[PDB]
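Continuing from the previous page...

OK, I double-checked the sequence for DNA-binding protein SATB1 against my notes and this is the correct one:
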Amino acid sequence: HHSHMLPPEQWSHTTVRNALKDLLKDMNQSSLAKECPLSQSMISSIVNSTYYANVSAAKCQEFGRWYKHFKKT
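Thanks. Re-ran it with the corrected sequence; updated structure tokens here:
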């Protein structure tokens, strides 16, 4: 159930990347950028980098809020 998704303040860069990779199984990067608060560049970096992602707390929370709402529809 969508209500069991972590609340925004619990999202880390790990939560964001894990969500992103499941999302990208069913939509492409361009579509994800249209939907969510991450930029094209940040999405690309998460997909491609060999290093951990730098995502601010504010952006993690913004993403987690979006994601839970997106799953609820």
